[PDB]
């Protein structure tokens, strides 16, 4: 059994700061859980219930680093933290994701790829940030209309950031929708974007999922 405790599946998989421990087992038969949906930053988790089906029984789990914090992001700023995600008393962010923002006042086109050479199915997770107004949008990413494209041999989708005044949730009126896919052995996944990308930092490899 996998012990999550005060955490949930969403918090554990994204690397919610309050779920820093309990990466625990390399295999398990059932998941032990019982928190504002578990997502630090407000948003909509895509196919969350289906993801719980896949992860409820696995045999060869592993958390690895799909895009190192350095080098893998030569341009763009990767230190983004927010009050919503807080470890102890300081601002933080997801352990497995990075908030990409301004670097020297520019947001160059993003294109980075990774080939699953681990002989297992790979679970990659990313996010799409949605600013509340356009001035803040331009303050971070410097593009009025941005795109995020995630493509592999068995997955493809382009994202458009919808910018509108939203009611503050958890002190935040912005949103980050989270999305996940499974990458088959040898398959290649590419992330293309010009803004609003919560870049993947840590991914996962597993079997029976």
């Amino acid at each position: 059994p996998l012990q999550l405790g005060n955490c949930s599946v969403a918090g554990w998989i994204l690397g919610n700061p309050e779920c820093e421990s309990l990466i625990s087992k390399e295999s398990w038969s059932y998941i032990v859980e019982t928190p504002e949906n578990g997502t630090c930053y407000p948003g909509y988790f895509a196919d969350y219930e289906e993801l719980r089906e896949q992860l409820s029984s696995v045999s060869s789990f592993e958390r690895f680093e799909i895009f190192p914090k350095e080098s893998s992001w030569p341009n763009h700023t990767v230190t983004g933290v927010t009050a919503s995600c807080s470890h102890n008393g300081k601002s933080s962010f997801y352990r497995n994701l990075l908030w990409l923002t301004e670097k020297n006042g520019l947001y160059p086109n993003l294109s980075n790829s990774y080939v699953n050479n681990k002989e297992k199915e790979v679970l990659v997770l990313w996010g799409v940030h949605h600013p509340s107004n356009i001035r803040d949008q331009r303050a971070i990413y410097h593009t009025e209309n941005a795109y995020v494209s995630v493509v592999s041999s068995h997955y493809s989708r382009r994202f458009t950031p919808e910018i509108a005044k939203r009611p503050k949730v958890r002190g935040q009126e912005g949103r980050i929708n989270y999305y996940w896919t499974l990458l088959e052995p040898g398959d290649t996944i590419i992330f293309e974007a010009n803004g609003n990308l919560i870049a993947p930092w840590y991914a996962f490899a597993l079997s029976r999922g």
Epitope: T79, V81, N104, S132, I140
Partner: antibody, heavy 130, light 109 residues
């Protein structure tokens, strides 16, 4: 790193137009920085004048909005200030500084809700006399 | 709209002193602090909440409690005799920048 150098007249006739220039070296004017002006009348404190973005967005001090005009010139990597209808109350030491980018709404990380000015010019004294 | 701070305070050598800054704009953005010695341009001593620039002694520390920002100097020394200004951005209108009146720190002893 970025360094700022002020250029301006030591003296400006009353009711005339004050004009200064701030040169940027070690960095690019076309960045997500707010290039700001500040002044300090003799024996008084600091008074924010205004700020400008490389794109052209301007925000002035409400009290000086009518007689102030901050400009930018990418040709020489500079930005400038213009204060018109000057009086003795405008006699002061004027600075140019660089302020960070910020956000109005709660959509951005914490780094965009600071306000500070880290790089300053050395200051230029401007006296208003006939 | 305006930031208000006491004009003058005194502290004995090696002691600690809290310089308080209060204003209805401190809720929107974090407050910065400067140190200005006579005949010199201001120098930034605190970026945000307790983040200092490179070259600023650990004696300088910042905090915030609602619309109240504070600058604390531990082990106060004669090199610290100067003016101190808090600074933040207004959370309304076109978001003007406002300065506090300044505080003259006298180091006794």
């Amino acid at each position: 790193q970025v360094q700022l150098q002020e250029s301006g007249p030591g003296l400006v006739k009353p009711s005339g137009t004050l004009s200064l220039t701030c040169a940027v070296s070690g960095g690019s004017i076309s960045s997500s920085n707010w290039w700001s002006w500040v002044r300090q009348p003799p024996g008084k404190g600091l008074e924010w004048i205004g700020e400008i973005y490389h794109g052209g967005s301007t925000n002035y001090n409400p009290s000086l909005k009518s007689r102030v005009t901050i400009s930018v010139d990418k040709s020489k990597n500079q930005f400038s200030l213009k204060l018109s209808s000057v009086t003795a109350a405008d006699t002061a030491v004027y600075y140019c500084a660089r302020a960070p980018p910020y956000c109005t709404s709660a959509s951005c990380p914490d780094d965009y809700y600071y306000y500070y000015m880290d790089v300053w010019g050395k200051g230029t004294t401007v006296t208003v006399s006939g | 709209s305006e930031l208000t701070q006491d004009p003058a305070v005194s502290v004995a050598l090696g002691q600690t002193v809290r310089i308080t800054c209060q204003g209805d704009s401190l809720r929107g953005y974090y407050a910065s602090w400067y140190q200005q010695k006579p005949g010199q341009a201001p120098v930034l001593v605190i970026y945000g909440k307790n983040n200092r620039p490179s070259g600023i002694p650990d004696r300088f520390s910042g905090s915030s409690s609602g619309n109240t920002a504070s600058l604390t100097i531990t082990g106060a020394q004669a090199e610290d005799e100067a003016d101190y200004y808090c600074n933040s951005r207004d959370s309304s209108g076109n978001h003007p920048v406002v300065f506090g009146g300044g505080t003259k720190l006298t180091v006794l002893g």
